Amino acid sequence: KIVNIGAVLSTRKHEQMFREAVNQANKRIQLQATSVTHKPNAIQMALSVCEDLISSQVYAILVSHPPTPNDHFTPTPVSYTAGFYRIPVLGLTTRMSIYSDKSIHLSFLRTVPPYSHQSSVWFEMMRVYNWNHIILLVSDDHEGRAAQKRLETLLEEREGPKAEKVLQFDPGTKNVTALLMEARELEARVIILSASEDDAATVYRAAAMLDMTGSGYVWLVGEREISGNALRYAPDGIIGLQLINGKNESAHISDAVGVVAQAVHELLEKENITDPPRGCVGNTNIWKTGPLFKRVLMSSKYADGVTGRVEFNEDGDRKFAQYSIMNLQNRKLVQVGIYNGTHVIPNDRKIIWPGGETEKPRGYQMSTRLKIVTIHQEPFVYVKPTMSDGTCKEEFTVNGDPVKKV
Amino acid sequence: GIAVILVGTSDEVAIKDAHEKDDFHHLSVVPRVELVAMNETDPKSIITRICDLMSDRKIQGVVFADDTDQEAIAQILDFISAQTLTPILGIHGGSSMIMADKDESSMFFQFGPSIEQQASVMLNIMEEYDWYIFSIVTTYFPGYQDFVNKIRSTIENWELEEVLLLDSKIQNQLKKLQSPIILLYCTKEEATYIFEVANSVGLTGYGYTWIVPSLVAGDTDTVPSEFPTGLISVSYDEWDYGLPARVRDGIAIITTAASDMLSEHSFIPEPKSSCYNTHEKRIYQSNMLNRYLINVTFEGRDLSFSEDGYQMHPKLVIILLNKERKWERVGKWKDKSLQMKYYVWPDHLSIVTL
Amino acid sequence: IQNQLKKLQSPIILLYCTKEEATYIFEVANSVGLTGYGYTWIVPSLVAG
Amino acid sequence: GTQERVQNSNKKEWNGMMGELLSGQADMIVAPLTINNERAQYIEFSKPFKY
Ligand SMILES: O=C(Nc1ccccc1)N[C@H]1C[C@H](C(=O)O)Nc2cc(Cl)cc(Cl)c21
Numbered sequence: 001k002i003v004n005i006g007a008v009l010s011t012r013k014h015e016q017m018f019r020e021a022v023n024q025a026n027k028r029i030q031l032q033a034t035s036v037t038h039k040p041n042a043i044q045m046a047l048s049v050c051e052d053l054i055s056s057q058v059y060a061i062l063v064s065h066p067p068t069p070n071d072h073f074t075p076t077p078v079s080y081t082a083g084f085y086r087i088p089v090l091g092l093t094t095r096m097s098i099y100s101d102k103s104i105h106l107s108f109l110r111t112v113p114p115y116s117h118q119s120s121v122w123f124e125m126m127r128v129y130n131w132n133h134i135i136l137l138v139s140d141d142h143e144g145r146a147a148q149k150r151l152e153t154l155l156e157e158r159e160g161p162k163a164e165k166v167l168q169f170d171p172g173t174k175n176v177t178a179l180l181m182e183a184r185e186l187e188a189r190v191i192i193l194s195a196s197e198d199d200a201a202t203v204y205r206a207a208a209m210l211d212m213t214g215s216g217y218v219w220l221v222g223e224r225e226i227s228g229n230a231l232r233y234a235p236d237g238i239i240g241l242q243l244i245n246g247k248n249e250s251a252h253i254s255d256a257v258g259v260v261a262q263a264v265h266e267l268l269e270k271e272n273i274t275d276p277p278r279g280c281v282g283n284t285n286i287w288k289t290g291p292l293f294k295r296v297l298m299s300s301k302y303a304d305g306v307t308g309r310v311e312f313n314e315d316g317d318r319k320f321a322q323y324s325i326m327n328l329q330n331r332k333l334v335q336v337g338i339y340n341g342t343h344v345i346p347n348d349r350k351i352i353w354p355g356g357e358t359e360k361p362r363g364y365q366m367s368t369r370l371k372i373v374t375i376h377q378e379p380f381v382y383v384k385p386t387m388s389d390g391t392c393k394e395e396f397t398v399n400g401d402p403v404k405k406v
Numbered sequence: 407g408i409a410v411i412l413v414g415t416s417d418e419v420a421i422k423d424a425h426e427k428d429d430f431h432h433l434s435v436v437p438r439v440e441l442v443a444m445n446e447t448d449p450k451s452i453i454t455r456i457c458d459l460m461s462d463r464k465i466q467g468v469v470f471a472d473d474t475d476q477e478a479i480a481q482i483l484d485f486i487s488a489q490t491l492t493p494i495l496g497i498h499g500g501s502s503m504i505m506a507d508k509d510e511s512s513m514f515f516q517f518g519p520s521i522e523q524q525a526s527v528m529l530n531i532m533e534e535y536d537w538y539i540f541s542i543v544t545t546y547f548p549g550y551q552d553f554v555n556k557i558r559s560t561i562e563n564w565e566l567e568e569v570l571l572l573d574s575k576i577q578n579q580l581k582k583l584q585s586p587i588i589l590l591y592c593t594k595e596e597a598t599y600i601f602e603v604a605n606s607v608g609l610t611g612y613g614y615t616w617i618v619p620s621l622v623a624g625d626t627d628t629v630p631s632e633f634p635t636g637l638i639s640v641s642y643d644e645w646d647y648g649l650p651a652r653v654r655d656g657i658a659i660i661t662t663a664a665s666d667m668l669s670e671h672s673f674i675p676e677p678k679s680s681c682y683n684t685h686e687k688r689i690y691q692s693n694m695l696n697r698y699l700i701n702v703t704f705e706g707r708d709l710s711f712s713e714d715g716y717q718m719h720p721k722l723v724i725i726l727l728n729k730e731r732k733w734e735r736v737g738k739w740k741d742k743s744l745q746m747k748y749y750v751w752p753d754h755l756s757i758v759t760l
Numbered sequence: 761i762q763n764q765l766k767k768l769q770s771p772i773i774l775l776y777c778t779k780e781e782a783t784y785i786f787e788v789a790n791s792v793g794l795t796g797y798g799y800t801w802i803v804p805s806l807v808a809g
Numbered sequence: 810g811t812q813e814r815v816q817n818s819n820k821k822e823w824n825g826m827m828g829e830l831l832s833g834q835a836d837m838i839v840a841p842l843t844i845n846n847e848r849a850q851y852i853e854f855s856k857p858f859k860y
Pocket residue numbers: 377380841842843
């Protein structure tokens with residue numbers, strides 16, 4: 001029994017690093033290293049998946065993303081191809097809600113948290129600053145859909161801060177000038193914005209056009225917004241979140257291969273490891289080892305990688321990971337705290353807030369105006385057409401005192 | 407071109423009868439029907455053959471049917487759909503009987519009914535025989551939130567027992583069994599175990615009647631023994647649909663879509679050259695005209711689909727597990743209307759008054 | 761046994777037995793019936809011996 | 810305004826001033842607005858001033 005393992009990566013030198021990883025795994029079953037690069041036109045990759053790897057006897061696969069801006073079409077061909085057999089696989093990179101759910105893809109596990117869960121930090125970011133009123137902006141994509149889902153569900157479960165309005169919109173928008181108008185005239189003053197990158201200008205340059213960033217204002221966005229605007233048009237003082245892994249597949253390899261090794265030790269007790277069916281053409285045989293391999297990888301806890309305590313959630317992404325509480329310094333970047341799994345850990349610096357005051361502004365202003373409406377009902381409501389001057393004529397009661405009219 | 411694939415162990419040679427029915431009329435652009443069948447072929451073989459043949463014979467539209475090797479095949483072209491921008495039609499097979507949502511950057515609607523449609527037909531059956539109360543339990547099968555939301559909304563315009571999702575809590579959940587009618591939205595593999603536990607707790611014969619959707623049994627012939635000697639199910643596929651009739655429906659759909667296309671602004675789907683490289687990605691950026699290929703008619707009825715893939719008001723039938731462990735066509739369904747050609751199914755008095 | 765225990769409807773439950781069988785019967789009770797806050801068990805003298 | 814199904818399967822909406830309160834248009838109602846159970850699940854009522 002020599003369980004060969006296959007990988008696909010974007011940098012061949014780090015594929016050699018993966019060969020070092022499989023040597024260290026030989027230091028520890030029996031492994032054999034094999035791997036393939038990636039090319040454009042994902043149909044060629046859906047060829048090479050079995051033209052190279054599925055042609056062998058594989059019980060776990062490695063997948064990672066390129067730098068190309070596809071970022072969604074990159075993991076799917078291999079995903080579909082292997083999934084035909086329910087083969088557990090390990091993703092290493094961009095964590096959009098591709099296989100966030102078990103519906104399309106079945107037994108995939110990843111090492112990077114998907115941009116959804118960054119909501120929860122915001123949640124406790126509230127329980128730090130006692131804010132209980134909140135505006136939310138979301139575009140009606142699947143990413144933002146799940147975003148609203150997770151956020152509203154967590155907040156309702158918190159029953160405290162209650163949501164105020166779920167303002168949805170569309171990606172392809174040149175101007176959201178109409179929506180921010182009704183937005184920035186409501187009660188609260190804290191705003192969360194999770195959408196695609198280039199939307200930020202569409203928001204930001206529209207916000208300052210409405211001066212929606214001057215003072216009595218607080219913002220909170222996702223990392224894509226941070227990058228795309230903190231280079232382009234970030235209104236200073238806005239706050240976001242930052243992840244530690246960033247863009248490098250190296251440490252992911254370490255996080256990955258260790259649990260791959262620790263797995264095979266969980267079926268060296270009953271010899272139900274019969275054979276991974278080599279070759280794509282030839283059999284619709286369901287390698288029913290898949291459910292067992294998945295149920296065990298869902299709990300193969302280790303501490304191999306650079307980051308201690310790399311484990312899984314019920315989704316198979318990075319669980320109990322670590323973020324850094326990013327912040328901007330009017331053109332510059334800093335970390336003023338490391339959110340450690342669940343710990344409330346800030347860090348010392350000049351924590352500015354929009355406009356540039358060392359105070360933490362309150363939630364709401366509680367305006368003095370109140371739009372009131374009412375219906376036509378003679379014995380409770382009398383309406384009269386105005387006079388030629390623009391009012392309606394005064395009159396006295398039978399007692400002689402005046403009567404109000406508005 | 408407009409091609410057809412008929413991989414599977416069947417009467418494909420006979421089914422080419424529909425070639426002349428295609429050859430005479432109902433084709434403005436007269437198409438090039440051509441079969442490329444296969445054996446029990448693997449996903450990768452399926453992909454390479456599909457794009458290779460679509461590239462060779464100059465194909466611009468396709469429809470296929472096969473043995474129910476796995477529902478995953480429905481997913482497998484969802485990728486290539488936008489990868490080459492061409493209408494796809496899964497038909498006549500359990501392979502093409504599952505739902506595949508949210509891939510809608512491209513084509514490939516399907517046939518048969520929707521979750522909502524079949525569910526409303528279940529409710530229609532429930533009224534037409536006055537079954538007042540109902541219970542329901544299900545699992546993580548696709549459409550659980552959809553089903554619970556649909557049934558919780560269509561009751562605010564019933565006599566439910568309870569909605570239950572399952573994962574020693576099984577018995578404490580089954581103890582709430584209170585309805586005179588029991589429902590389940592599942593498949594046969596788990597249905598074995600669930601009818602087992604049902605015999606373990608719930609009644610099976612005279613005292614309860616089991617009703618389930620089309621894709622619980624999948625095919626039409628197998629039967630795990632734990633099922634009661636009666637099952638009200640609903641489908642259309644393998645009881646009236648002739649394969650030549652189905653492929654005729656398909657070629658009609660594509661030809662009338664081509665009619666709408668060449669009429670609106672007179673653009674033919676450009677021939678995708680290669681399934682290989684970025685030089686073929688040149689046409690991949692050309693215009694897309696998918697939507698307006700959906701309001702077209704022939705053989706009388708309209709064939710409008712929603713933006714997701716299901717036709718409106720399908721033609722449907724209701725079957726029942728008889729005593730010989732077989733199914734029988736007992737209910738007609740047409741034009742959002744039901745016809746139950748069989749009364750209550752075996753304290754039995756018959757009263758009379760004036 | 762289960763089809764009989766399904767008629768469990770009372771807020772108070774009685775049993776006239778002895779300890780040896782009481783082991784098995786409280787076992788099946790946990791298997792079906794509630795045990796803590798929700799039911800109170802009353803029994804005669806010669807159940808525990 | 811009352812709860813009414815709209816788009817024939819889509820939503821349940823309030824067809825009037827009650828909705829205008831829930832929609833975000835209004836902020837307070839003063840009119841002979843009735844009190845019952847159905848409305849009480851989305852509004853907050855002062856004590857009644859005129860039986
Ligand atoms: O019946 C109606 N509108 C209607 C108008 C034309 C045709 C049919 C019905 N309104 C009712 C309901 C609503 C209320 O809060 O009670 N306004 C309101 C206020 C008062 Cl003072 C008395 C009543 Cl009954 C009503």
